[PDB]
Design a protein around this ligand. Structure first.
Ligand SMILES: CC(C)CN(C[C@@H](O)[C@H](Cc1ccccc1)NC(=O)O[C@H]1CO[C@H]2OCC[C@H]21)S(=O)(=O)c1ccc2c(c1)OCO2
Ligand SMILES: [Cl-]
Ligand SMILES: [Cl-]
Ligand code: NA
Lengths: 99, 99
């Protein structure tokens, strides 16, 4: 699709069999999701946003559907205010910015 | 242009007679620029992101040139770690997300 930006570019994602809402976010290097259970081991990561840095749990090679497109990649889990799909998965679904 | 998302979608902007680098950010409702002077009236605002909130100055009806495209809108000025072009101005240059 071609998504305009008059409203938040919210899509449905599927992770762990559950549907969630998430923001397509070209200003996010990484994908960050609210607290949830994911399988496997995790590694520590600190990410820096507008208000400062937070600690998150990094899960690699997680299967996630984004707006009907399949991706498998790194998902960070932590106290983000909204679920954000960052460039690491936007590139896997073939997203570009166009003007 | 068509901008891929392998790297940060940074562009050059002109604001307040100054050239700056800024992030084209579909996850940002608002445009947020590092501390600078702008003419006219402003009012305080709090905006929140990962890490929490920062206090900003809200300037309305500011003209910005974004990758050579002129837009006018509200610009928030404050201690953002990155200059961000948010949806309020991305719409005006006709930016879309495509996949
Ligand atoms: C988190 C989302 C919902 C909002 N943010 C825009 C993001 O694109 C933000 C923009 C951002 C970019 C860099 C530094 C700080 C903020 N990115 C971000 O936090 O990404 C984090 C996850 O991946 C990492 O790579 C980027 C930082 C990490 S934001 O910067 O907090 C923001 C911008 C304008 C706003 C606003 C919040 O509220 C109202 O207007
Ligand atoms: Cl830790
Ligand atoms: Cl505006
Ligand atoms: Na003004």
């Amino acid at each position: 699709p071609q998504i305009t930006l008059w409203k938040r570019p919210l899509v449905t994602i599927k992770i762990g069999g559950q549907l969630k809402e998430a923001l397509l976010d070209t200003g996010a290097d990484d994908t960050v999701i609210e607290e949830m259970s994911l399988p496997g081991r995790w590694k520590p990561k600190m990410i820096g946003g507008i208000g400062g840095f937070i600690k998150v749990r990094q899960y690699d090679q997680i299967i996630i559907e984004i707006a009907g497109h399949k991706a498998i990649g790194t998902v960070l889990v932590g106290p983000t205010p909204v679920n954000i799909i960052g460039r690491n998965l936007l590139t896997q679904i073939g997203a570009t910015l166009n003007f």
